Amino acid sequence: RWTALTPEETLFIYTRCQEEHLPADNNSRKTYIENWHQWKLQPNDHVTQCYTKCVLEGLELYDGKQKKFRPGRVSSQHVAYQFLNGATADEVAKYKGAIDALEPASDSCEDLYMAYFPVHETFVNVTRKLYHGTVEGAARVYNSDPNLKRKNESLFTYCEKHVYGDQNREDMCRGRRYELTGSDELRNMIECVFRGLRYIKHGDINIDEIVRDFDHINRGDLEPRVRTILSDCRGIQPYDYYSCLINSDIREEFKLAFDYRDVRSADYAYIVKGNTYDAQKVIAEMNKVEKHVCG
């Protein structure tokens, strides 16, 4: 059935929705950052409204497919962390029952926001306890499961640790230097990375997500080539798509995109905070950890 979201998972939702909906640079941006980070769903305009729709769907609290709310997932989210939550059974019951009564007029930003706004005004602190929306709460979870990826930890070094252990240090160095060693470990390394980046989800490649990482290095021009290479790849494990890019004519631009995404994988709010692309600093960081892993 439905599995409760981890703080890594909900942090990804909160920040990705911000990337999707924050006005790019416009004088209004900081207003949405200062409000939303307070969990203040204000101002009541199109930006805020689509943002709450984005978060409601990312938490899978509103079900896009079935076009309805899923009050059962509230309690599921609760029980999976009830001993670190701080959430009382009564809170969750009233929150659950409030949601259970929501039938919005449509799945539009406006109608969803209209429907859910009073539940949020009333139960916001229950949401934050349940879906890891406080730094202190979420840190309790992080401290109880050391296998969760931490907020300031590269997805890449996280995967290297869990896949490689203290074995095959040279193959790991080879894998990080973009050589296609073909070992079981590198393959599971690529799979581990592709899942954390949401390059793969529900077991299928997500070509949009990889194109997005090319956009981030200012190579939106390469979108058709990226899609062709992946759509033509003769395998469907993460290591296959990865080899298809590495053996392609855009392999150098892919490394640039992959490395930038590593950096941003270590701070999910990277873009939200206002950071921009600097290929020189990206390489510097990659060389540093490259030096540590290898000689």
Tab-separated table of C-alpha atoms in Angstrom:
chain	number	residue	atom	x	y	z
A	1	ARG	CA	0.000	0.000	0.000
A	2	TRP	CA	1.016	3.661	0.397
A	3	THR	CA	4.411	4.158	2.046
A	4	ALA	CA	5.038	7.156	4.271
A	5	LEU	CA	7.393	9.798	2.914
A	6	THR	CA	10.803	10.281	4.474
A	7	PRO	CA	12.171	13.716	5.381
A	8	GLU	CA	14.526	13.433	2.396
A	9	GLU	CA	11.464	12.782	0.244
A	10	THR	CA	9.360	15.651	1.608
A	11	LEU	CA	12.334	18.041	1.554
A	12	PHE	CA	12.666	17.197	-2.139
A	13	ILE	CA	8.981	18.047	-2.644
A	14	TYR	CA	9.109	21.325	-0.717
A	15	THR	CA	12.143	22.641	-2.592
A	16	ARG	CA	11.283	21.257	-6.033
A	17	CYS	CA	7.858	22.884	-5.823
A	18	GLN	CA	9.619	26.133	-4.933
A	19	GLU	CA	11.843	25.819	-8.019
A	20	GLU	CA	8.743	25.175	-10.123
A	21	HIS	CA	6.731	28.134	-8.826
A	22	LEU	CA	8.920	30.865	-7.325
A	23	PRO	CA	8.922	33.879	-9.713
A	24	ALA	CA	12.384	33.862	-11.336
A	25	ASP	CA	14.241	36.885	-9.847
A	26	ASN	CA	11.144	39.190	-9.953
A	27	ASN	CA	10.781	41.596	-6.936
A	28	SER	CA	7.957	39.327	-5.657
A	29	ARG	CA	10.214	36.265	-5.082
A	30	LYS	CA	11.421	36.995	-1.548
A	31	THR	CA	7.821	37.592	-0.477
A	32	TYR	CA	6.963	34.001	-1.354
A	33	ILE	CA	10.159	32.680	0.229
A	34	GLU	CA	9.571	34.531	3.482
A	35	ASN	CA	5.900	33.500	3.650
A	36	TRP	CA	6.134	29.858	2.549
A	37	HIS	CA	9.106	29.156	4.832
A	38	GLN	CA	6.811	30.312	7.638
A	39	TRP	CA	4.204	27.931	6.141
A	40	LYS	CA	2.111	31.057	5.572
A	41	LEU	CA	0.120	30.317	2.391
A	42	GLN	CA	0.166	34.012	1.474
A	43	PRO	CA	-0.377	36.120	-0.509
A	44	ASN	CA	-3.516	34.522	-1.927
A	45	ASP	CA	-2.551	34.738	-5.609
A	46	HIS	CA	-1.790	32.423	-8.534
A	47	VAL	CA	1.809	31.711	-7.451
A	48	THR	CA	0.935	30.723	-3.880
A	49	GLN	CA	-2.055	28.762	-5.161
A	50	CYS	CA	-0.125	26.614	-7.620
A	51	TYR	CA	2.566	26.131	-4.992
A	52	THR	CA	0.107	24.620	-2.512
A	53	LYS	CA	-1.270	22.431	-5.316
A	54	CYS	CA	2.297	21.313	-6.075
A	55	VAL	CA	3.032	20.470	-2.439
A	56	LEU	CA	-0.334	18.764	-1.944
A	57	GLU	CA	0.424	16.485	-4.875
A	58	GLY	CA	4.048	15.932	-3.912
A	59	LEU	CA	3.077	14.825	-0.438
A	60	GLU	CA	0.579	12.608	-2.313
A	61	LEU	CA	-2.046	14.063	0.051
A	62	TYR	CA	-4.114	15.058	-2.973
A	63	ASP	CA	-4.123	12.227	-5.531
A	64	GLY	CA	-3.603	13.570	-9.037
A	65	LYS	CA	-4.608	10.390	-10.865
A	66	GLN	CA	-7.834	9.729	-8.943
A	67	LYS	CA	-8.439	13.512	-8.481
A	68	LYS	CA	-9.346	13.206	-4.788
A	69	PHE	CA	-7.872	13.589	-1.326
A	70	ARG	CA	-6.559	10.479	0.452
A	71	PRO	CA	-7.267	10.879	4.188
A	72	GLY	CA	-5.935	7.383	4.875
A	73	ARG	CA	-2.423	8.503	3.964
A	74	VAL	CA	-2.536	11.015	6.821
A	75	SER	CA	-2.579	8.294	9.471
A	76	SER	CA	-0.076	6.200	7.486
A	77	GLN	CA	2.280	9.195	7.444
A	78	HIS	CA	1.710	9.529	11.191
A	79	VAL	CA	2.259	5.955	12.373
A	80	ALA	CA	5.516	5.605	10.420
A	81	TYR	CA	7.049	8.256	12.703
A	82	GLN	CA	4.741	8.515	15.724
A	83	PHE	CA	7.605	7.998	18.207
A	84	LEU	CA	9.565	10.947	16.829
A	85	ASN	CA	6.606	12.970	15.426
A	86	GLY	CA	5.483	14.858	18.470
A	87	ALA	CA	2.009	14.436	16.984
A	88	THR	CA	-0.869	13.434	19.243
A	89	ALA	CA	-3.530	10.983	18.133
A	90	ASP	CA	-6.213	13.651	18.483
A	91	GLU	CA	-4.447	16.126	16.173
A	92	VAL	CA	-4.140	13.491	13.462
A	93	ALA	CA	-7.761	12.440	13.883
A	94	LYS	CA	-9.161	15.967	13.498
A	95	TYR	CA	-6.711	16.696	10.666
A	96	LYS	CA	-7.654	13.398	9.015
A	97	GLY	CA	-11.368	14.024	9.399
A	98	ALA	CA	-11.114	17.580	8.054
A	99	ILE	CA	-9.376	16.363	4.901
A	100	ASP	CA	-11.826	13.465	4.514
A	101	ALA	CA	-14.573	16.074	3.988
A	102	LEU	CA	-12.791	17.969	1.196
A	103	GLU	CA	-14.315	17.709	-2.255
A	104	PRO	CA	-12.806	20.567	-4.287
A	105	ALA	CA	-14.607	22.062	-7.276
A	106	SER	CA	-11.698	20.976	-9.579
A	107	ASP	CA	-7.993	20.163	-9.556
A	108	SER	CA	-7.121	23.773	-10.471
A	109	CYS	CA	-4.656	25.673	-8.309
A	110	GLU	CA	-7.376	28.067	-7.234
A	111	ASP	CA	-10.002	25.483	-6.333
A	112	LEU	CA	-7.556	23.237	-4.482
A	113	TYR	CA	-6.230	26.211	-2.533
A	114	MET	CA	-9.751	27.455	-1.833
A	115	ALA	CA	-10.727	24.020	-0.507
A	116	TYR	CA	-7.630	23.290	1.605
A	117	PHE	CA	-6.800	26.755	2.965
A	118	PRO	CA	-8.911	26.493	6.171
A	119	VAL	CA	-7.632	22.992	6.904
A	120	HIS	CA	-4.093	24.370	6.556
A	121	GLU	CA	-4.810	27.472	8.657
A	122	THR	CA	-6.203	25.163	11.329
A	123	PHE	CA	-3.814	22.187	11.183
A	124	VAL	CA	-0.561	23.556	9.688
A	125	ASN	CA	1.439	22.405	12.743
A	126	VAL	CA	0.063	18.905	12.346
A	127	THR	CA	1.212	18.863	8.708
A	128	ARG	CA	4.686	20.022	9.764
A	129	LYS	CA	4.971	17.285	12.432
A	130	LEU	CA	3.673	14.599	10.065
A	131	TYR	CA	5.567	15.543	6.897
A	132	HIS	CA	8.847	16.672	8.447
A	133	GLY	CA	8.184	20.402	8.074
A	134	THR	CA	10.290	21.496	11.050
A	135	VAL	CA	14.080	21.449	11.240
A	136	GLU	CA	13.970	20.056	14.802
A	137	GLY	CA	11.346	17.411	14.098
A	138	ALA	CA	12.997	16.337	10.851
A	139	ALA	CA	16.372	16.185	12.611
A	140	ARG	CA	14.893	13.746	15.159
A	141	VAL	CA	14.085	11.446	12.255
A	142	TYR	CA	17.495	11.988	10.667
A	143	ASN	CA	19.164	11.028	13.934
A	144	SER	CA	17.110	7.857	14.318
A	145	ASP	CA	17.774	6.508	10.813
A	146	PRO	CA	21.458	6.964	9.874
A	147	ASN	CA	20.692	5.434	6.462
A	148	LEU	CA	18.690	8.518	5.494
A	149	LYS	CA	20.640	10.898	3.290
A	150	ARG	CA	21.468	14.005	5.317
A	151	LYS	CA	20.649	17.522	4.146
A	152	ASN	CA	24.253	18.567	3.439
A	153	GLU	CA	25.471	15.259	2.024
A	154	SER	CA	25.978	14.702	-1.696
A	155	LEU	CA	23.701	12.021	-3.074
A	156	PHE	CA	26.810	10.811	-4.869
A	157	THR	CA	28.992	10.235	-1.817
A	158	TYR	CA	25.961	8.805	-0.016
A	159	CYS	CA	25.497	6.216	-2.769
A	160	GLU	CA	29.251	5.469	-2.969
A	161	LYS	CA	29.265	4.714	0.759
A	162	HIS	CA	26.263	2.398	0.802
A	163	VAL	CA	27.137	0.564	-2.415
A	164	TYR	CA	30.930	0.254	-2.126
A	165	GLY	CA	31.384	-0.104	1.668
A	166	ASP	CA	35.096	-0.374	2.408
A	167	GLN	CA	35.600	-2.680	-0.624
A	168	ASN	CA	36.677	-2.012	-4.255
A	169	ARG	CA	38.101	1.496	-3.603
A	170	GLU	CA	39.845	1.486	-7.003
A	171	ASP	CA	36.714	0.579	-8.958
A	172	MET	CA	34.847	3.329	-7.087
A	173	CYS	CA	37.581	5.774	-8.124
A	174	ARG	CA	37.254	4.476	-11.688
A	175	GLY	CA	33.481	4.903	-11.576
A	176	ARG	CA	33.774	8.465	-10.268
A	177	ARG	CA	36.224	9.243	-13.091
A	178	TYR	CA	33.426	8.319	-15.542
A	179	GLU	CA	35.023	5.078	-16.745
A	180	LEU	CA	32.484	2.369	-17.620
A	181	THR	CA	34.043	-0.403	-15.543
A	182	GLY	CA	30.907	-2.573	-15.754
A	183	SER	CA	31.261	-3.932	-12.203
A	184	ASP	CA	28.195	-4.924	-10.198
A	185	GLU	CA	29.075	-2.081	-7.821
A	186	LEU	CA	29.212	0.713	-10.393
A	187	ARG	CA	25.915	-0.551	-11.815
A	188	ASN	CA	24.263	-0.416	-8.394
A	189	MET	CA	26.038	2.900	-7.834
A	190	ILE	CA	24.422	4.320	-10.984
A	191	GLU	CA	21.065	2.891	-9.949
A	192	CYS	CA	21.388	4.385	-6.462
A	193	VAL	CA	22.233	7.796	-7.966
A	194	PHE	CA	19.488	7.643	-10.604
A	195	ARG	CA	16.821	6.928	-7.970
A	196	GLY	CA	17.900	9.778	-5.693
A	197	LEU	CA	17.927	12.206	-8.617
A	198	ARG	CA	14.498	10.975	-9.768
A	199	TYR	CA	16.084	10.151	-13.128
A	200	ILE	CA	14.223	6.868	-12.626
A	201	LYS	CA	10.881	6.557	-10.857
A	202	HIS	CA	8.396	3.691	-10.639
A	203	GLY	CA	11.156	1.835	-12.509
A	204	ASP	CA	10.934	3.899	-15.700
A	205	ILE	CA	13.413	6.474	-16.920
A	206	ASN	CA	12.292	10.076	-16.473
A	207	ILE	CA	13.748	11.826	-19.533
A	208	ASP	CA	12.321	15.189	-18.453
A	209	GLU	CA	14.434	15.109	-15.279
A	210	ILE	CA	17.680	14.592	-17.203
A	211	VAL	CA	16.817	17.320	-19.754
A	212	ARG	CA	16.273	19.623	-16.760
A	213	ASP	CA	19.856	19.035	-15.606
A	214	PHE	CA	21.086	20.020	-19.077
A	215	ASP	CA	18.951	23.174	-18.860
A	216	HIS	CA	20.665	23.946	-15.558
A	217	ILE	CA	24.095	24.085	-17.242
A	218	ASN	CA	22.579	26.402	-19.911
A	219	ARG	CA	22.525	23.656	-22.560
A	220	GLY	CA	18.788	23.613	-23.195
A	221	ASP	CA	19.878	23.621	-26.857
A	222	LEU	CA	20.821	19.935	-26.423
A	223	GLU	CA	17.356	18.726	-25.326
A	224	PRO	CA	16.494	16.906	-28.599
A	225	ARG	CA	19.845	15.144	-28.606
A	226	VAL	CA	19.455	14.127	-24.943
A	227	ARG	CA	15.979	12.709	-25.588
A	228	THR	CA	17.133	10.875	-28.721
A	229	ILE	CA	20.079	9.264	-26.969
A	230	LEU	CA	17.952	8.064	-24.058
A	231	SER	CA	14.940	7.091	-26.181
A	232	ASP	CA	17.309	4.995	-28.334
A	233	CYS	CA	19.268	3.350	-25.499
A	234	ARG	CA	19.322	-0.446	-25.856
A	235	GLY	CA	18.791	-1.171	-22.126
A	236	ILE	CA	16.627	0.043	-19.263
A	237	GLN	CA	18.787	-0.282	-16.237
A	238	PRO	CA	20.219	3.042	-14.975
A	239	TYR	CA	23.720	1.879	-15.969
A	240	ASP	CA	22.559	1.501	-19.588
A	241	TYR	CA	21.208	5.068	-19.973
A	242	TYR	CA	24.332	6.255	-18.160
A	243	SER	CA	26.572	4.381	-20.625
A	244	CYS	CA	24.484	5.634	-23.552
A	245	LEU	CA	25.203	9.217	-22.480
A	246	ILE	CA	28.846	8.521	-21.683
A	247	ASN	CA	29.369	6.907	-25.105
A	248	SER	CA	27.493	9.666	-26.929
A	249	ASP	CA	28.672	12.835	-28.647
A	250	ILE	CA	27.397	14.988	-25.767
A	251	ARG	CA	29.272	12.977	-23.116
A	252	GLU	CA	31.321	15.988	-21.982
A	253	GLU	CA	28.234	18.142	-21.542
A	254	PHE	CA	26.566	15.296	-19.647
A	255	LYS	CA	29.508	15.147	-17.218
A	256	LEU	CA	29.076	18.895	-16.676
A	257	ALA	CA	25.355	18.365	-16.056
A	258	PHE	CA	25.955	15.321	-13.842
A	259	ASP	CA	28.550	17.175	-11.742
A	260	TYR	CA	26.440	20.286	-11.302
A	261	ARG	CA	23.559	18.078	-10.164
A	262	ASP	CA	25.856	16.377	-7.642
A	263	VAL	CA	26.584	19.770	-6.079
A	264	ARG	CA	22.890	20.594	-5.927
A	265	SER	CA	22.177	17.106	-4.580
A	266	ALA	CA	24.052	18.200	-1.426
A	267	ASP	CA	21.689	21.171	-0.810
A	268	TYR	CA	18.149	20.647	-2.082
A	269	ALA	CA	17.459	24.384	-1.589
A	270	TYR	CA	20.478	25.307	-3.763
A	271	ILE	CA	18.407	27.115	-6.401
A	272	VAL	CA	15.744	28.414	-3.989
A	273	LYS	CA	18.481	30.206	-1.998
A	274	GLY	CA	19.594	32.036	-5.156
A	275	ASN	CA	22.708	30.136	-6.228
A	276	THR	CA	23.646	30.182	-9.921
A	277	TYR	CA	25.767	27.987	-12.181
A	278	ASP	CA	29.536	28.288	-11.862
A	279	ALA	CA	31.268	25.532	-13.832
A	280	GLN	CA	34.644	26.401	-12.292
A	281	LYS	CA	33.494	25.960	-8.706
A	282	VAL	CA	31.661	22.773	-9.694
A	283	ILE	CA	34.871	21.270	-11.115
A	284	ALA	CA	36.864	22.372	-8.081
A	285	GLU	CA	34.527	20.489	-5.764
A	286	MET	CA	34.515	17.424	-8.017
A	287	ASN	CA	38.329	17.370	-8.190
A	288	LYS	CA	38.581	17.678	-4.401
A	289	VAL	CA	36.401	14.658	-3.633
A	290	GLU	CA	37.955	12.910	-6.643
A	291	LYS	CA	41.336	13.408	-4.951
A	292	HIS	CA	40.016	11.911	-1.658
A	293	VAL	CA	38.328	8.818	-3.199
A	294	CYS	CA	41.346	7.983	-5.395
A	295	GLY	CA	44.932	8.949	-4.666
